[PDB]
Structure formats: structure tokens, C-alpha cells
């Protein structure tokens, strides 16, 4: 199989035009931000990563035509999954099994997570690394990644929105694009599309666990005041 080249669905070509290179997001967040892991700094880093995701959504086809109430509902249903997918893809590209790469460029040894993290977080980090391994084995590429981000953003049943038609059409176009692209570019991975949808089931499971970790921190009064992920958690 091989990525890109000819025969790429229009939706995917459009999404690639809206996806910043990792180096550019890094610079932006390091700019917005400025031993034991610095907890509040990492919380601010995750908030800034979500702000970057909201900026991407704002520019996307379809999403940019929706009224604010529909935009908020979509993001309220997808924020945690978009953050998990962003972290997972960053690891797939990084390609190191003994460390994790943060959006700031910081590298964190997994041995350090075993020393510093409690059980909820340690288990979550390791479960996420298993999905990273699966996606690397499946040869997840950038075309698939951006389509998966769009699919998640638009994952909500349209009955919860004012503009049913536009979002339903976006859902259908994104599923068709991922199916067409994977079949044409990875013909010998015959069930790649289904395998990516099963990977999204795992992103949702990881997201739920991440929400439970944030809720435990919130009840313990450990989160910074006015944290954006907690606002999303309570919405």
C-alpha cells in the first residue's frame, strides 16, 4: 500500500489543506504557555491543544457553515475523542515504545510514568500505547488520520442538531471517503476500513477513561481553576 498520490477523495484532499504540520502546532502552544511532572502546566498544555482543535474545526468544511449552537453541541460530544486521537497519532508518528511525545516536544519516558502516576493514569497511558502499536501495524497514514478527525467531529447523531441535512451529508461523505481511500491505497489490507472504525471504538473507550480520570481530579480539587477540559466535562 502507499499513501496519497493519485485517486484521493476530495474530502481528504480538502482536510489535508486544513491540517497544520506538528511543528507549527508545537510552536504555537509552547508560545501560549511560557523532576516531578509539572501537573498544572500539563493541564494548561492539554487546554491549549483543545483550543488548537477548536481552531481547526472552525475552519472545516461544513462545520464553518453551522450556527454556533450546532458547533458547540458537536464539540461537546467529541472533545475528548479528538484530544485522544491527537495524542495517539502523535505517538504513531514518533515511533518510540519506551517514551511518549507531548505536543510541546517534551519526551516523557514511560519509566517516569510508572514512578509518578497513580493507577488510573498509568493504566490509561499504557492502554493508549497499545492502540498506538495497533495503528502503526495497520499503517495508519495522514490521509486516514484527518478523515478520522472529521468523522469524530461529526459523530453525533443528527437528531441533536438544528442542521440535520448538512451534517448527515458530511457523515456520509466522510465514511465514503475513508472506505474509498483505504480500498484504493491499501488493497491488501482488505478490512482496513473496519479496522479503523474498531480503532475509533477504542478511542472512545480511552476517552471515557480519561474523563473518569479528570472527574477524580476535579472531585479532589486538583484541577486548575477555569480549566477548559473541566468546562467540557461538565457541559
Amino acid at each position: 500500500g502507499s499513501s496519497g498520490g493519485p485517486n484521493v477523495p476530495e474530502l481528504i484532499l480538502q482536510l489535508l489543506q486544513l491540517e497544520p504540520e506538528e511543528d507549527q502546532v508545537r510552536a504555537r502552544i509552547v508560545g501560549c504557555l511560557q523532576q516531578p511532572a509539572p501537573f498544572s502546566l500539563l493541564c494548561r498544555m492539554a487546554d491549549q491543544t483543545f483550543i488548537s482543535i477548536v481552531d481547526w474545526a472552525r475552519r472545516c468544511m461544513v462545520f464553518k457553515e453551522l450556527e454556533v449552537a450546532d458547533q458547540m453541541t458537536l464539540l461537546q460530544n467529541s472533545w475528548s475523542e479528538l484530544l485522544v486521537l491527537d495524542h495517539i497519532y502523535r505517538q504513531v508518528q514518533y515511533g518510540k515504545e519506551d517514551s511518549i511525545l507531548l505536543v510541546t516536544g517534551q519526551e516523557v519516558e514511560l519509566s517516569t510514568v510508572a514512578v509518578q502516576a497513580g493507577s488510573l493514569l498509568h493504566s490509561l497511558v499504557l492502554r493508549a500505547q497499545e492502540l498506538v502499536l495497533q495503528l502503526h501495524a495497520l499503517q495508519l497514514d495522514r490521509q486516514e488520520f484527518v478523515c478520522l478527525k472529521f468523522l469524530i467531529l461529526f459523530s453525533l447523531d443528527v437528531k441533536f442538531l438544528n442542521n440535520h441535512s448538512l451534517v448527515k451529508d458530511a457523515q456520509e461523505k466522510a465514511n465514503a471517503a475513508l472506505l474509498d481511500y483505504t480500498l484504493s491505497h491499501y488493497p491488501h489490507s482488505g478490512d482496513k476500513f473496519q479496522q479503523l472504525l474498531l480503532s475509533l471504538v477504542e478511542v472512545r473507550a480511552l476517552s471515557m477513561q480519561a474523563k473518569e480520570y479528570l472527574y477524580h481530579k476535579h472531585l479532589g480539587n486538583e484541577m486548575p481553576r477555569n480549566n477548559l477540559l473541566i468546562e467540557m466535562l461538565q457541559a
Binding site: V68, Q71, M72, L75, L228, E231, A235
Partner: peptide, 10 residues
């Protein structure tokens, strides 16, 4: 009710 999310989208 003003929220951070609404401020990001406006």
C-alpha cells in the same frame, strides 16, 4: 451563560 467554548467560537 458565557463560557470559554462560546468565546472560542464567536
Amino acid at each position: 451563560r458565557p463560557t470559554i467554548l462560546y468565546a472560542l467560537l464567536s
